Amino acid sequence: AKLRSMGYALTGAVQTLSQISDINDENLQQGIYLLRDHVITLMEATLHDISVMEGMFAVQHLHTHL
């Protein structure tokens, strides 16, 4: 047994955009439009505060965030 839902992939078509800005195009309709490329993010880069903290003080600040 190995579950995996097709609840967001049921219709067998998909309408994709090349930029978030394209969502405001006036001759689009009322539907779901997906941005074509994934957004890749490293937490180390996002959380600046921790970078300058040291020892357990750094560790406890990350725990609160997670």
Partner: protein
């Protein structure tokens, strides 16, 4: 016609019911952490704050099982949490440090 239903659907067989009793004691926590009489006061304030807040929004409910006071595991774990390392020594006869 049809539209997707993304949430799972579970068919119920039965229900299992459990009762868990959680026992908290500051003195046991203060001994392992080598705390001082000043920090013992912080530990005590901190634990009451959190427990009291929970106490203040929950009414009581009757649950149809037997009294914990009659169950071995309740008697054994309560005596332990209070008196595990407590002993009494009796001199052959009374004699003090000279």
């Amino acid at each position: 016609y049809y539209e997707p239903h993304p949430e799972p659907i579970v068919v119920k067989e039965r229900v299992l019911g459990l009762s868990q009793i959680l026992m908290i004691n500051s003195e046991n926590i203060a001994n392992n952490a080598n705390l001082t009489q000043e920090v013992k006061k912080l530990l005590t304030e901190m634990v009451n704050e959190e427990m009291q807040s929970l106490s203040d929004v929950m009414i009581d409910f009757e649950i149809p099982l037997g009294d914990p006071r009659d169950q071995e595991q309740y008697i054994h774990r309560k005596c332990y949490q209070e008196f595990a390392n407590c002993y009494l020594v009796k001199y052959k006869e009374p004699k003090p440090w000279p």
